[PDB]
Amino acid sequence: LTEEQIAEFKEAFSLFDKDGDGTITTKELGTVMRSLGQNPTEAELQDMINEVDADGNGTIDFPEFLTMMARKMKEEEIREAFRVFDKDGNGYISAAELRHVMTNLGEKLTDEEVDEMIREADIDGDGQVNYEEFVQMMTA
Amino acid sequence: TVGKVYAALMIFDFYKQNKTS
Ligand SMILES: [Ca+2]
Ligand SMILES: [Ca+2]
Ligand SMILES: [Ca+2]
Ligand SMILES: [Ca+2]
Numbered sequence: 001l002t003e004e005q006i007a008e009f010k011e012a013f014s015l016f017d018k019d020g021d022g023t024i025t026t027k028e029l030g031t032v033m034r035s036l037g038q039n040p041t042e043a044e045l046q047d048m049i050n051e052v053d054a055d056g057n058g059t060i061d062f063p064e065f066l067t068m069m070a071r072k073m074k075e076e077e078i079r080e081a082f083r084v085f086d087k088d089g090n091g092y093i094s095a096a097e098l099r100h101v102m103t104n105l106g107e108k109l110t111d112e113e114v115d116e117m118i119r120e121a122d123i124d125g126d127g128q129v130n131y132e133e134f135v136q137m138m139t140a
Numbered sequence: 141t142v143g144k145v146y147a148a149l150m151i152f153d154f155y156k157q158n159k160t161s
Pocket of ligand 4: 122123124125126127128129130133
C-alpha cells in the first residue's frame with residue numbers, strides 16, 4: 001500500500017465517521033446508505049458490521065474499515081452503483097453529478113477537486129465517466 | 141482522492157451483499 005491510498009482511505013473512513021469519534025456506528029452507515037438512495041434496515045446494518053467486527057465491540061474502526069474494502073475487493077451490482085451517480089441516466093457521470101453525490105455525502109469540494117476526480121476515473125478523455133470507465137474504477 | 145468515491149461504493153456493495161428481502 002502507498003502513502004496516497006492511506007490518505008484516501010482515511011478520508012473515505014471520514015465520509016462515514018460523521019461525528020469524528022474514530023468509529024462508524026450503524027447509525028452512520030444507515031445515514032450514508034440513505035444519502036446514496038438506499039434504505040437498509042437496522043438488521044442489515046448490524047450484519048454489515050458483524051461481518052467485520054473483529055473486536056466484536058459493535059462498531060467499525062479504521063483497521064476493520066480497511067478489512068471491508070479488502071473483502072469487497074474480492075456485476076448487476078455495478079450498474080446500480082453507477083446509476084447512483086448517473087443522476088439523469090444519460091450514461092455518463094459528469095463532474096456536476098459527481099459533485100452532487102459528494103455533497104450529498106456531506107463533502108465540500110472545490111471545483112478543481114471534483115475535476116481531479118473526474119480526471120482519474122476518465123480513461124478516454126471526453127471529460128466524463130462512462131459505465132465502462134465506472135466499471136474499471138470499481139475494479140481498481 | 142478518487143478513493144473517496146471508491147470506498148463509498150465498497151460499503152455500498154457491502155450492504156447489497158447483506159440485504160434480506
Ligand atoms: Ca462515529
Ligand atoms: Ca469493531
Ligand atoms: Ca449523467
Ligand atoms: Ca470518459
